[PDB]
Design an enzyme around this catalytic site. Structure first.
Site, PDB file in Angstrom:
ATOM      1  N   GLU A   1      67.566 -56.114  30.310  1.00 10.70           N
ATOM      2  CA  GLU A   1      67.352 -57.339  29.549  1.00 10.70           C
ATOM      3  C   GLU A   1      68.305 -58.447  29.981  1.00 10.70           C
ATOM      4  O   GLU A   1      67.894 -59.606  30.110  1.00 10.70           O
ATOM      5  CB  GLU A   1      67.517 -57.067  28.052  1.00 10.70           C
ATOM      6  CG  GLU A   1      66.430 -56.206  27.419  1.00 10.70           C
ATOM      7  CD  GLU A   1      65.051 -56.844  27.411  1.00 10.70           C
ATOM      8  OE1 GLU A   1      64.903 -58.022  27.787  1.00 10.70           O
ATOM      9  OE2 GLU A   1      64.102 -56.142  27.002  1.00 10.70           O
TER      10      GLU A   1
ATOM     11  N   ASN B   1      60.653 -68.124  26.616  1.00 12.13           N
ATOM     12  CA  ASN B   1      59.345 -67.491  26.653  1.00 12.13           C
ATOM     13  C   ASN B   1      58.252 -68.547  26.762  1.00 12.13           C
ATOM     14  O   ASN B   1      58.443 -69.713  26.404  1.00 12.13           O
ATOM     15  CB  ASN B   1      59.156 -66.654  25.390  1.00 12.13           C
ATOM     16  CG  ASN B   1      60.200 -65.563  25.281  1.00 12.13           C
ATOM     17  OD1 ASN B   1      60.528 -64.911  26.274  1.00 12.13           O
ATOM     18  ND2 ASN B   1      60.783 -65.408  24.103  1.00 12.13           N
TER      19      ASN B   1
ATOM     20  N   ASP C   1      64.804 -65.889  24.117  1.00 13.68           N
ATOM     21  CA  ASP C   1      65.503 -64.619  23.975  1.00 13.68           C
ATOM     22  C   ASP C   1      66.992 -64.812  24.231  1.00 13.68           C
ATOM     23  O   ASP C   1      67.377 -65.516  25.168  1.00 13.68           O
ATOM     24  CB  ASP C   1      64.976 -63.587  24.974  1.00 13.68           C
ATOM     25  CG  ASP C   1      63.544 -63.148  24.700  1.00 13.68           C
ATOM     26  OD1 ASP C   1      62.954 -63.494  23.658  1.00 13.68           O
ATOM     27  OD2 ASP C   1      63.006 -62.408  25.552  1.00 13.68           O
TER      28      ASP C   1
ATOM     29  N   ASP D   1      55.694 -69.059  25.066  1.00  7.21           N
ATOM     30  CA  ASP D   1      55.290 -69.608  23.779  1.00  7.21           C
ATOM     31  C   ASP D   1      56.301 -70.586  23.189  1.00  7.21           C
ATOM     32  O   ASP D   1      56.044 -71.142  22.116  1.00  7.21           O
ATOM     33  CB  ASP D   1      54.951 -68.471  22.803  1.00  7.21           C
ATOM     34  CG  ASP D   1      56.182 -67.721  22.301  1.00  7.21           C
ATOM     35  OD1 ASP D   1      57.303 -67.958  22.799  1.00  7.21           O
ATOM     36  OD2 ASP D   1      56.025 -66.867  21.405  1.00  7.21           O
TER      37      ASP D   1
ATOM     38  N   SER E   1      59.460 -69.809  22.266  1.00  9.84           N
ATOM     39  CA  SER E   1      60.596 -69.071  21.737  1.00  9.84           C
ATOM     40  C   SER E   1      61.590 -68.791  22.861  1.00  9.84           C
ATOM     41  O   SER E   1      61.301 -68.997  24.044  1.00  9.84           O
ATOM     42  CB  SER E   1      60.136 -67.764  21.092  1.00  9.84           C
ATOM     43  OG  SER E   1      59.541 -66.890  22.037  1.00  9.84           O
TER      44      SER E   1
ATOM     45  N   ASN F   1      64.570 -62.213  20.258  1.00  4.93           N
ATOM     46  CA  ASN F   1      63.628 -63.336  20.335  1.00  4.93           C
ATOM     47  C   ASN F   1      63.624 -64.186  19.063  1.00  4.93           C
ATOM     48  O   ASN F   1      63.389 -63.660  17.968  1.00  4.93           O
ATOM     49  CB  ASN F   1      62.220 -62.762  20.538  1.00  4.93           C
ATOM     50  CG  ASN F   1      61.207 -63.796  20.996  1.00  4.93           C
ATOM     51  OD1 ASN F   1      61.380 -64.995  20.785  1.00  4.93           O
ATOM     52  ND2 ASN F   1      60.123 -63.326  21.609  1.00  4.93           N
TER      53      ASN F   1
HETATM   54 NA    NA Z   1      62.927 -59.792  27.471  1.00  2.67          NA
END
Ligand code: NA
Ligand SMILES: [Cl-]
Ligand SMILES: [Cl-]
Ligand SMILES: [Cl-]
Ligand SMILES: [Cl-]
Ligand code: NA
Length: 129
Positions: free
Chosen positions: A35, A46, A52, A48, A50, A59
């Protein structure tokens, strides 16, 4: 902060993640590796809108507030910036809520795709824990 492998394993164990919801420590270290490469300051946007945050790339769609994710929730009741701290407490406490939400560690797509079913104990091999 960029943790060492065994350093992060030790911190995760101190914060109660070893075998949390049945997931051994190597699962958590493996997830963090893919990650964030063990970097608490990692962020990724992201598609969309959002974002992380942190070692486990939690998220803003559901888990933290960043003020810029329309329609999102803040189920961990924290600013997303808390997930970037050198102190992993906020990330760990929020990860505990996520992994308890029904799908276990499959919530982390990188865990499912890169850690699940593998020899995750290799991630804590040799560490003094
Ligand atoms: Na991720
Ligand atoms: Cl490594
Ligand atoms: Cl393990
Ligand atoms: Cl928001
Ligand atoms: Cl599970
Ligand atoms: Na949010």
């Amino acid at each position: 902060k960029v943790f060492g492998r065994c350093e992060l394993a030790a911190a995760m164990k101190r914060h109660g993640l070893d075998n949390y919801r049945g997931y051994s420590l190597g699962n958590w270290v493996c997830a963090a590796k893919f990650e964030s490469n063990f970097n608490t300051q990692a962020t990724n946007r992201n598609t969309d809108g959002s974002t992380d945050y942190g070692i486990l790339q939690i998220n803003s769609r559901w888990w933290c507030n960043d003020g810029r994710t329309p329609g999102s929730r803040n189920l961990c009741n924290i600013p997303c910036s808390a997930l970037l701290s050198s102190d992993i407490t906020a990330s760990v406490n929020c990860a505990k809520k996520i992994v308890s939400d029904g799908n276990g560690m499959n919530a982390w797509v990188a865990w499912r795709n890169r850690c699940k079913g593998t020899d995750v104990q290799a991630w804590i091999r040799g560490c003094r824990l």
